[PDB]
Amino acid sequence: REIITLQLGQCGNQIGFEFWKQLCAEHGISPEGIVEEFATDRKDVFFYQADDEHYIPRAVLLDLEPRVIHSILNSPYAKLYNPENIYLGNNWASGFSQGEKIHEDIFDIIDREADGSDSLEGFVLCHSIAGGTGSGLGSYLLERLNDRYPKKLVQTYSVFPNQDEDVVVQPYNSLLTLKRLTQNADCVVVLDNTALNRIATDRLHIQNPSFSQINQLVSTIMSASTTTLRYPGYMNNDLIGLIASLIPTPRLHFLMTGYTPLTTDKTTVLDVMRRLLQPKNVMVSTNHCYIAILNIIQGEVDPTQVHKSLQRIRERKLANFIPWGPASIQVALSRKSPYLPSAHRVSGLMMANHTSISSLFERTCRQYDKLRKREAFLEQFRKEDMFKDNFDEMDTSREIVQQLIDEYHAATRPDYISWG
Amino acid sequence: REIITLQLGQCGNQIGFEFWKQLCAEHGISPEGIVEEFATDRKDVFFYQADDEHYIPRAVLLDLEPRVIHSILNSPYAKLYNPENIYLGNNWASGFSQGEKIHEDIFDIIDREADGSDSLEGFVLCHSIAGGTGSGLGSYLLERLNDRYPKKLVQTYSVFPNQDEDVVVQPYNSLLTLKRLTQNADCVVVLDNTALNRIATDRLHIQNPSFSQINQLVSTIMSASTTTLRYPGYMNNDLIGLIASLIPTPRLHFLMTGYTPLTTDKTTVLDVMRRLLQPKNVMVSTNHCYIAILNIIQGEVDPTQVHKSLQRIRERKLANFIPWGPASIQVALSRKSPYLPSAHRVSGLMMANHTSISSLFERTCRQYDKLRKREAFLEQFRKEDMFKDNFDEMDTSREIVQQLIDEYHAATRPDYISWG
Amino acid sequence: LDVLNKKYSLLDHMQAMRRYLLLGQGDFIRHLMDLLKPELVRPATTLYQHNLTGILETAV
Ligand SMILES: Nc1nc2c(ncn2[C@@H]2O[C@H](COP(=O)(O)OP(=O)(O)O)[C@@H](O)[C@H]2O)c(=O)[nH]1
Ligand SMILES: Nc1nc2c(ncn2[C@@H]2O[C@H](COP(=O)(O)OP(=O)(O)O)[C@@H](O)[C@H]2O)c(=O)[nH]1
Known part of the structure; x- marks a missing residue:
């Protein structure tokens, strides 16, 4: 079934704008959505088919207090995304x-696309955590979607924000977002501003314009995470079929990222795998262990020897995984697209469930716990107090996220066989 | 056999004037009825063959308190329709x-034509419901025709009036017309002013001159509903042969309309069928289901694909029906005429028995029921009171139409095998 | 061999005897299995071939 992406908030709207542009050039599409004359891919899922081959992405763009939604409109690609569905604080x-006041018109815009498509399998949100307008609006829309589509599943390309710690309420906003995310999101893929900023400092000298350049980094991961769906093959055809292996228990559902050619601009499979497990390639910032790992490779990989390769990785004991029950490394392979320069033909990404990400959640919980005692930034703005006089959703969020922090470390233990 | 059209009332006389004009250009006829140098059709059923090729339509034009019958006379087509048969309130x-006073002279005008034809097949009325003069005169003439021609059938191109609800007695007038129409009309084809007005707003910006432009829309449907009869071929050659499939119960004889290219100003059969089942192409405004569906296509249509095409729509199931009947959607095909434009080389129409039309009948019954309690507009005009002192025909009509409203919903149920 | 490979395309078939029959097509085989679920879950001692030939066509 076709995937509908609910890109929301200025930051979220920036990475959806680029992700669709990235698949414009990668696929056979021009800036006016017209089939390219120069042009073997499954474009049905991501791109709606118009009568005259105007393949329009099923993007839902939500603007709140809009500024960069206006810049998105003055672009050569304004015609490419025309479902004609864009509708008009830092807390x-x-x-x-x-x-909440505009929920029904934004929700009808969701309905229109759902009716228009032959079918709808998942809602992929370009969410921004502690995103000012992006968070809060994104949590609420996350809660409505599951109730209306109980059978359907929601993923989140959460750009978890770490900038070395401006938002003085940033921990409070993030704390609330996760509580909604931990129980009202089927999958979440985590990214980190600092981790990517550190990569930007590593691969390039770019430091001050970190947000503009890092957009390309988030994009390469985003296009890549879907390439096995956007291009066809014998396994991992649909989204869910892929989602199951990466998330082994509903509570434990945040995914780490990695790209072997971080410096993207021959290499044997044995090499591109080893390079990825190294931590400089990783884009996220008591024993600790992965729960299950997966990898996808797109290039002139010799497909016959991707087995002999795995046997070697297994014996070098380069990875630990989990003691409770069975888990294993999983090799997957795809076609890099033609048309675009296939320089560095072999490029590999990895998506993995790792207990280290618990530490990033605890750091915002640490800032919040410190901030909660001081009550330095309760906002006490009438919106904040009138909306939350008890201020107990923050405490409800604190126990839920603490259960999550606890559940992760329980996974490290030998007995997740007993309750976690 | 030959069909005589009893166009009556100012509104009815407007759509008969245009329908005959539409078949003037479509057929080989000029504004003086003479054949033209530029112009294989069974012209006979719809046109009397004079001696010097003056093909005069067998139109019966009835004028009451005439205003728009005088404008019809000052036209270039005044000579085209010369059976010399036109004879001189809003309740x-x-x-x-x-x-009733002029019934015998109008009825002799019916006889004259009936004598002229070899075999008379049906009386097709360009009726206006709640048409002021058009309704009431049309109901009475509907009652006389069946008694005089018990073997013969009567169809009604009823322009059921919905203008968002000026006539303050409009529901009362309409209520009475249907009671006559339910027991004294073998077939009825329903059209809606609002449904077409909504189409006019959709295809064009025309809003204020809704009546003049919508005349063309009613015409395209009217010419089209008969095209299988007018042209040669072994395709439903006669009216009655076609009427049977669309109407499967003596009581439910109301037919819905649709046109695949509302914007008619190549396309495969698989496409023109799917487009039609969609509700924008429809021109009419608890489970609900069609009783039996039929479609006719006139253009450059391949023959081999139709079976492939018949099967494809069935798998899509865009049309949902569960009637007491075992009826199936039926494919029919005709020739587009030469001379006139061939734009939308393939272009179609559908006539179907749908239980949704019950809802439109109930809405006027709702306005009437509300109006009946208030007795706000009993007219109490001496004509109204003296003609109807008991005012019990309205109640007789209310039970008969309620039986119809009930019968329809009984059709939706699994046991219309039992009494409605 | 030349004529076999342009007048009967002996090779283009081998590429489409694995792509479709051995499940290598991948996508065609998951949209057929989705649309064939209601019909198949019913005992096929009562199944008719006119509804299978019809649904594969939708899938392709
Ligand atoms: N990755 C990435 N994150 C961004 C970018 N711009 C803003 N952000 C993040 O967005 C968050 C704040 O959202 P904000 O821009 O305030 O949304 P606004 O309230 O609509 O302005 C911060 O945590 C930033 O890390 C960008 O270009 N790339
Ligand atoms: N479709 C259509 N309906 C019309 C037109 N003119 C009038 N009507 C309908 O005719 C009905 C009223 O009839 P009316 O014109 O009052 O008849 P009169 O008593 O002879 O004037 C209304 O319900 C209108 O919807 C037209 O041009 N097109």
Whole structure:
């Protein structure tokens, strides 16, 4: 079934704008959505088919207090995305309240696309955590979608924000987003501003314009995470079929990223795998262990020897994984696209469930716990107090996320066989 | 055999004027009825063959308090329709009484034509429901025709009026017309002013001159509903042969309309069928289901694909029906005419028995029920009271139409095998 | 061999005798299995071939 992407918030709208542009050039599409004359791919899932081959992405663009939604409109690609579905504070509470009054018209825009498509399998959100308007509005829309589509599943390309710690309420906003995310999201893929900023400092000298350049880094991961769906093959055809292996228990569902050619601009499979497991290639910032790992490779990989390769990785004991029950490394292979320069033909990404990401969640919980005692930034803005007089959703969020922090470390233990 | 059209009332006279004009250009006829140098059709059923090729339509034009019958006379086509048969209130009762005094001369005009034809097959009325003079006169003439021609059938191109609800007695007039129409009309084809007005707003910006432009829309449907009869071929050559499939119960004889290229100004059969089942192409405004569906296509249509095409729509199931009947969607094909434009080389129409039309009948019954309690507009005009002192025909009509409203919903149920 | 490979395309078939029959097509085989679920879950001692030939066509 076709995937509908609910890109929301200025930051989220920036990475959806680029992700669709990235698949414009990668696929046979021009800036006006017209089939390219120069042009073997499954474009049905991501791109709606118009009568005259105007393959329009099924993007839902939500603008709140818009500024960069106006810049998106003055672009050569304005015609490419024309489902004609764009509808008009820095606080999580401020975003949640604004979303509630306009919920029905934004929700009808969701319906239109659902009716238009032959079918709808998942809602992929370009969410921004502690995103000012992006968070709060995104949590609320996350709660409505599951109730309306109980059978359907929701993924989140959460750009978890770590900038070395401006938002003084950033921990409070993030704390609330996760509680909604931990129980109202089927899957989440985690990214880190600092981890990518550190990569940007590593591969390039770019430091001050970190947000503009890092957009390309988030994009390469995003296009790549879907390439096994966007191009066809004998295994991992549909989204869910792929989602199951990466998330082994509903509570434990945040995914780490990695790209072997971080410096993207021959190499044997044995090499591209080893390079990935190294930590400089990783884009995320008591024993600790992965729960299950997966990898996808797109290039002139010799497909016959991707087995002999795995046997070697297994004996070098380069990876630990989990003691409770069975898990294993999983090799997957795809076609890099033609048309675009296939320089560095072999490029590999990995998506993995790792207990280290618990540490990033605890750091915002640490900032929040410190901030909660001080009550330095309760906002006490009438919106904040009137929306939350008890201020107990933050405590409800604190116990839920602490259960998650606890559940992760329980996975490290030998007995997730007993309750976690 | 030959069909005589009893166009009556100002509104009805407007759509008969245009329908005959539409078949003037479509067929080989000029504005003086003479054949033209530029112009294989069974012209006979719809046109009397004079001696010097003056193919005069067998139109019966009835004028009551005439205003738009004088404008019809000052036209270039005045010579085209010369059977020399035109004979001289806004209330249903006011129209019915006026018809009764002149019934014998209007009825002799019916006889004259009936004598002229070899075999008379049917009386097709360009009826206007709640048409002021058009309704009441039309109901009375509907009752006389069946008694005189018990073997013969009567169809009604009823322009059921929905203008968002000026006539303050409009529901009362309409209520009475249907009671006559349910027991004294073998077939009825329903059209809606609002449904077409909504189409006019959709295809064009025309809003204020809704009546003049919508005339063309009613015409395209009217010419089209008969094209299988007018042209040669072994395709449903006669009216009655076609009527049987669309109407499967004596009581439910109301037919819905649709046109695949509302914007008619190549396309495969698989496409023109799917487009039609969609509800924008429809021109009419608890489970609900069609009773039996039929379609006719006139253009450059391949023959081999139709079976492939018949099967494809069945798998899509765009049309959902579960009637007491075992009826199936039926494919029919005709020739587009030469001379006139061949734009939308393939272009189609559908006539179907749908239980949704019950809802439109109930809405006027709702306005009437509300109006009946208030008795706000009993007219109490001496014509209205003297003609109807008991005012019990309205109640007789209310039970008969309620039986119809009930019968329809009984059709939806699994046991219309038992009494409605 | 030349004529076999342009007048009967002996090779283009081998590429489409694995792509479709051995499940290598991947996508065609998951949209057929989705649309064939209601019909198949019913005992096929009562199944008719006119509804299978019809649904594969939708899938292709
Ligand atoms: N990865 C990435 N993150 C961004 C970018 N721009 C803003 N952000 C993030 O967006 C978050 C704040 O969202 P904000 O821009 O305030 O949304 P606004 O309220 O609509 O302005 C911060 O945590 C930033 O890390 C960008 O270009 N790339
Ligand atoms: N479709 C259509 N309906 C019309 C047109 N003119 C009038 N009507 C309908 O005719 C009905 C009223 O009839 P009316 O014109 O009052 O008849 P009169 O009593 O002779 O004037 C209304 O319900 C209108 O919807 C037209 O040009 N097109």
